[PDB]
Design a protein around this ligand. Structure first.
Ligand SMILES: [Mg+2]
Ligand SMILES: [Mg+2]
Ligand SMILES: [Mg+2]
Ligand SMILES: [Mg+2]
Ligand SMILES: [Mg+2]
Ligand SMILES: [Mg+2]
Ligand SMILES: [Mg+2]
Ligand SMILES: [Mg+2]
Ligand SMILES: [Mg+2]
Ligand SMILES: [Mg+2]
Ligand SMILES: [Mg+2]
Ligand SMILES: [Mg+2]
Ligand SMILES: [Mg+2]
Ligand SMILES: [Mg+2]
Ligand SMILES: [Mg+2]
Ligand SMILES: [Mg+2]
Ligand SMILES: [Mg+2]
Ligand SMILES: [Mg+2]
Ligand SMILES: [Mg+2]
Ligand SMILES: [Mg+2]
Ligand SMILES: [Mg+2]
Ligand SMILES: [Mg+2]
Ligand SMILES: [Mg+2]
Ligand SMILES: [Mg+2]
Ligand SMILES: [Mg+2]
Ligand SMILES: [Mg+2]
Ligand SMILES: [Mg+2]
Ligand SMILES: [Mg+2]
Ligand SMILES: [Mg+2]
Ligand SMILES: [Mg+2]
Ligand SMILES: [Mg+2]
Ligand SMILES: [Mg+2]
Ligand SMILES: [Mg+2]
Ligand SMILES: [Mg+2]
Ligand SMILES: [Mg+2]
Ligand SMILES: [Mg+2]
Ligand SMILES: [Mg+2]
Ligand SMILES: [Mg+2]
Ligand SMILES: [Mg+2]
Ligand SMILES: [Mg+2]
Ligand SMILES: [Mg+2]
Ligand SMILES: [Mg+2]
Ligand SMILES: [Mg+2]
Ligand SMILES: [Mg+2]
Ligand SMILES: [Mg+2]
Ligand SMILES: [Mg+2]
Ligand SMILES: [Mg+2]
Ligand SMILES: [Mg+2]
Ligand SMILES: [Mg+2]
Ligand SMILES: [Mg+2]
Ligand SMILES: [Mg+2]
Ligand SMILES: [Mg+2]
Ligand SMILES: [Mg+2]
Ligand SMILES: [Mg+2]
Ligand SMILES: [Mg+2]
Ligand SMILES: [Mg+2]
Ligand SMILES: [Mg+2]
Ligand SMILES: [Mg+2]
Ligand SMILES: [Mg+2]
Ligand SMILES: [Mg+2]
Ligand SMILES: [Mg+2]
Ligand SMILES: [Mg+2]
Ligand SMILES: [Mg+2]
Ligand SMILES: [Mg+2]
Ligand SMILES: [Mg+2]
Ligand SMILES: [Mg+2]
Ligand SMILES: [Mg+2]
Ligand SMILES: [Mg+2]
Ligand SMILES: [Mg+2]
Ligand SMILES: [Mg+2]
Ligand SMILES: [Mg+2]
Ligand SMILES: [Mg+2]
Lengths: 94, 271, 45, 23
RNA sequence: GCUCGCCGGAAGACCAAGGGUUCCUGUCCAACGUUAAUCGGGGCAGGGUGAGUCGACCCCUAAGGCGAGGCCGAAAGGCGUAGUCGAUGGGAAACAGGUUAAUAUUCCUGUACUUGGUGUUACUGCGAAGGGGGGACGGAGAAGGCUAUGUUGGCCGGGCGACGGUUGUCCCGGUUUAAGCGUGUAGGCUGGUUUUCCAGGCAAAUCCGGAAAAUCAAGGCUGAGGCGUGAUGACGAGGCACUACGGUGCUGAAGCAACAAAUGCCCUGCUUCCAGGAAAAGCCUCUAAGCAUCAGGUAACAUCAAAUCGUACCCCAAACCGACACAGGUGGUCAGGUAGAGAAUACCAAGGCGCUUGAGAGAACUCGGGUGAAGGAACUAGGCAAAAUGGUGCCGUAACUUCGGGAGAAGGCACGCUGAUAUGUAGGUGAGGUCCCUCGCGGAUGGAGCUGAAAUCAGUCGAAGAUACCAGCUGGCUGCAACUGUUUAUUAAAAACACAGCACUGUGCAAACACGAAAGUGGACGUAUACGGUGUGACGCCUGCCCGGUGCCGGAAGGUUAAU
RNA sequence: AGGACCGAACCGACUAAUGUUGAAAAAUUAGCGGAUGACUUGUGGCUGGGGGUGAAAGGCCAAUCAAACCGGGAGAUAGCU
């Protein structure tokens, strides 16, 4: 059984893009932005416990952050993790 | 035998093979092979210590019965195989209880003979029996020199020692190099000349056969520079200095024996 | 031609990495000479 | 912005002799 | 958008290494782009990489590295055993189709497969840090079966031609379908089945090995491809359409046959040669310990899991290595058409590009080229450079020679298209059909259809038939070196170096010798037919004289002679 | 069958011309040699400076080699400019 504060610490944001919206409508997959050291089982348990929604499988990847040049000094944006949580067949979660 | 290769090609013009149908075409015996990594002439420090070693075909070091431990079991020779390591052929020999070994091949050996080691053995080529019981004047090979180590004298292609004397508890050998030598008489020896006695009658033909045997090219002294060798340098061909090894010791005719511990086993020097 | 730097990060980290500097005796004085010099990256790794 | 893309001229590499020498 | 050109064994596609957001959208053109720029691999903001099956991580080792103890060493540390790491190798499992501006063997649809836990049913010898089998291995070649893949016909759909002719023996396009599962073929390999025993595999044995005895000469192992099935599906030229002209949805026929054929598969096979061709785990099996019907094992059956990391893009380059958006360099995989022997070469398809300065004018002179009167090396250091010769089949061929060579010696002839032999021959492939059939992917006459050289005779065209591209200059005397090889990366490729062969010499194995104060290691897991060193440099004929000098080897009788 | 033959990949580097402050701190073009071996190449390992390695040229050891490079002795020394 996973720690409840850990499952409260993992989910950080949803994701807001055209691919995210089309994946939400055509396949019932919510797209989340999760913590850096999350894993698939912890994300699935947290998304079943917090939102209270039945969840089939989870697909994670690691977005590489860009290297920007603000002002004149170069700098590194912070990497993170993106997760395509699908839902069960015929189940709404906004 | 010796089959002069017909001179269809330069380099093939001079080759002489040693063909033999008896050397078993096929596989070795899998419980007796090993791995044998080619050295390159390079010790643990990493340097080239001995030169002109490197390259060649990959070999697998057979394990051989140099100690002849299984006494008292009459052991028939299964087949005759081609050892790449040493000069002589080997004979995979099957024992009575059924544990095969490899023995360095004597002269007139063939698949069918009985080779029996021990002390009880009769005197036929292959039968290893100690020099307390070898008849004097005979010829033997695979001779140990400290009792129970593995054969060390006369185990090349067709070499053989002679047992010229026995007195006290020392046998006196006339070795293949013409040197007479005491050996303690409890050592085992194996009767007969060793097999591949046409191994000197081969020629290599071309430089590629030396590179297949696994020797590099040797660059002689007087075509080098004086940093790289003693005889180096010189405008033209100049060799005015005395012949010396690359580290400054004379080669042509200089005795370099050192071990005083076995000077007691030198009945007569070689000549 | 074939220039004299054909990069390979396996050999790079294996010969000039932090652990390959830390293993020897005058490799630990290499890292202690760059810390006193206060450099940004001590080695490649 | 202001990039100011003017790095210093490190130009001279080496030389050789390579000339028909009066001797 | 329309033309034109170029690559097309690449200047196309997929990757690893490497780089690190360059990928895609929107916006701006200050700087960067060898110019302009609304453009961009430039700035800015946003978006983008989805894995039980691909690859890392993991299990197993090679060369090798670190190496508890230990040996050795002024100190530092050097070596090395147990071990533990180390892939470029070994080890379970996923294909097809569709979508995105950007991912896809990862997403979605369809059909799968693998290893583990758990629990339920039945059954009983399970267990290893061990023994054994297997994993598990070279170069060359040759043949057979196939496949990828193409060509031709059929079939379905479209067309009747901007210019003579074009209802045909016409033109154009399509003619796709996997993994998995069954069937176990072309083939290859192996004698099986059973009983008793054993000086053996550190003990253990029913396993392996070795002997003796009975029965059967057919059981097993391995195996590309085919045929089903997956598939009734998907894909499909196309139509029908709503408009943001960008699109987008529904439907959607034929979907076979013959021949040719790979370097890919059977093949980790077979023949053959000597230069004698990784290791350990997976995996199968035997048992000692012990555990005693507890555990465990194995045939199922359900149920849960398969984590983490890379998956964008370039990847023979404008993004890696070269200071540059640099005619340089860089390893694997896929390899279509027409001639061709060919992956050369010429033109092409799919595809991708026109090399990030252009417009003139048509002087000298320079670079890359084309042709040339008459002569043909007169040029010159020197035929340097150019020019020529070039192919396939046949005729022919000398001096010399180590009998192989020389030799493709030289030198010459034929070469297109069309007709006949023969409306496409010999040969290859084999549909039917017929008979057996140990009945199936079986075997014999049977040759339809398909493909298809090559030769002779005749006719005819051109000045020229290998018509283009590709494609030996030949001969004579001689030096040096036997040859194939290697070198002064970047002014010297040779007559220099090596070389097989010859000889001398050292070395009796705890070798000589080298690297190391030393351990040790190479020598060598080799043993005088071996190894080091030296000189010479195939093969034929040969190697003559000198021991005064300097070396080296043998003497220890005498002179001189150190520490003590 | 062969360190056989002719010849593309691939390795080279023999001749000529062009460039030589170039397109390039050794290259392009046209020819040329080997092209089943003493071949060539990917990936990892090894040998360290009087040392390595060398089919031997005093060659190669990061565009540098009759003894690398980086720091230190060090403001060496210089009857010389
Ligand atoms: Mg992933
Ligand atoms: Mg030698
Ligand atoms: Mg020699
Ligand atoms: Mg030599
Ligand atoms: Mg020289
Ligand atoms: Mg000297
Ligand atoms: Mg002279
Ligand atoms: Mg003289
Ligand atoms: Mg740095
Ligand atoms: Mg073209
Ligand atoms: Mg490309
Ligand atoms: Mg950027
Ligand atoms: Mg773009
Ligand atoms: Mg844009
Ligand atoms: Mg402007
Ligand atoms: Mg501009
Ligand atoms: Mg940009
Ligand atoms: Mg896999
Ligand atoms: Mg391991
Ligand atoms: Mg080890
Ligand atoms: Mg160690
Ligand atoms: Mg210790
Ligand atoms: Mg690998
Ligand atoms: Mg692997
Ligand atoms: Mg893409
Ligand atoms: Mg999925
Ligand atoms: Mg085993
Ligand atoms: Mg082979
Ligand atoms: Mg086919
Ligand atoms: Mg057609
Ligand atoms: Mg018309
Ligand atoms: Mg008309
Ligand atoms: Mg199938
Ligand atoms: Mg990619
Ligand atoms: Mg450009
Ligand atoms: Mg370039
Ligand atoms: Mg082609
Ligand atoms: Mg071409
Ligand atoms: Mg002009
Ligand atoms: Mg001309
Ligand atoms: Mg003229
Ligand atoms: Mg004319
Ligand atoms: Mg004329
Ligand atoms: Mg003349
Ligand atoms: Mg003249
Ligand atoms: Mg003149
Ligand atoms: Mg010429
Ligand atoms: Mg010409
Ligand atoms: Mg002369
Ligand atoms: Mg030569
Ligand atoms: Mg040559
Ligand atoms: Mg070389
Ligand atoms: Mg040169
Ligand atoms: Mg070279
Ligand atoms: Mg040259
Ligand atoms: Mg030793
Ligand atoms: Mg010579
Ligand atoms: Mg000579
Ligand atoms: Mg003489
Ligand atoms: Mg003398
Ligand atoms: Mg004398
Ligand atoms: Mg004399
Ligand atoms: Mg003396
Ligand atoms: Mg050849
Ligand atoms: Mg060229
Ligand atoms: Mg050739
Ligand atoms: Mg030095
Ligand atoms: Mg010199
Ligand atoms: Mg250099
Ligand atoms: Mg010096
Ligand atoms: Mg000064
Ligand atoms: Mg001083």
């Amino acid at each position: 059984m996973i720690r409840e504060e850990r499952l409260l610490k993992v989910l950080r944001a949803p994701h807001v893009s055209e691919k995210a919206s089309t994946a939400m409508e055509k396949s019932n997959t919510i797209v989340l932005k999760v913590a850096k050291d999350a894993t698939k089982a912890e994300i699935k348990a947290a998304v079943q416990k917090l939102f209270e929604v039945e969840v089939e499988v989870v697909n994670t990847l690691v977005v590489k952050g860009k290297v920007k040049r603000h002002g004149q000094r170069i700098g590194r944006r912070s990497d993170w993790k993106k997760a395509y949580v699908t839902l069960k067949e015929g189940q709404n979660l906004d | 035998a010796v089959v002069k290769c017909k001179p269809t090609s330069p380099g093939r013009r001079h080759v002489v093979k040693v063909v033999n149908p008896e050397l078993h075409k096929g596989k070795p015996f899998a419980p007796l092979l090993e791995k044998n990594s080619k050295s390159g002439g390079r010790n643990n420090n990493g340097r080239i210590t001995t030169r002109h070693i490197g390259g060649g075909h990959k070999q697998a070091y057979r394990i051989v019965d140099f100690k002849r431990n299984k006494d008292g079991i009459p052991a028939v020779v299964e087949r005759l195989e081609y050892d790449p390591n040493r000069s002589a052929n080997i004979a995979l020999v099957l024992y009575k209880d059924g544990e095969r070994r490899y023995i360095l091949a004597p002269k007139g050996l063939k698949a069918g003979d009985q080779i029996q080691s021990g002390v009880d053995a009769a005197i036929k080529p292959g039968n290893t029996l100690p020099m307390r019981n070898i008849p004097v004047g005979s010829t033997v090979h695979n001779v140990e020199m400290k009792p129970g180590k593995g054969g060390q004298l006369a185990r090349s292609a067709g070499t053989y020692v002679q047992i010229v004397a026995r007195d006290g508890a020392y046998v006196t050998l006339r070795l293949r190099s013409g040197e007479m030598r005491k050996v303690e008489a409890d050592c085992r020896a194996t009767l007969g000349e060793v097999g591949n006695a046409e191994h000197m009658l081969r020629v290599l033909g071309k430089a590629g056969a030396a590179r297949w045997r696994g020797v590099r090219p040797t660059v002689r002294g007087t075509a080098m520079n004086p940093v790289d060798h003693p005889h180096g340098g010189g405008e033209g061909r100049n060799f005015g200095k005395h012949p010396v090894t690359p580290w400054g010791v004379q080669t042509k005719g200089k005795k370099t024996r050192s071990n005083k511990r076995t000077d007691k086993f030198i009945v007569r020097r070689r000549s | 031609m074939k220039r004299t730097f054909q990069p390979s990060v396996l050999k790079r980290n294996r010969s000039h990495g932090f652990r390959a500097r830390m293993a020897t005796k005058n490799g630990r004085q290499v890292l202690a000479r760059r810390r006193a010099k206060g450099r940004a990256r001590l080695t490649v790794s | 912005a202001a990039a100011a893309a003017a790095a210093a001229a490190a130009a001279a590499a080496a030389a050789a002799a390579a000339a028909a020498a009066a001797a």
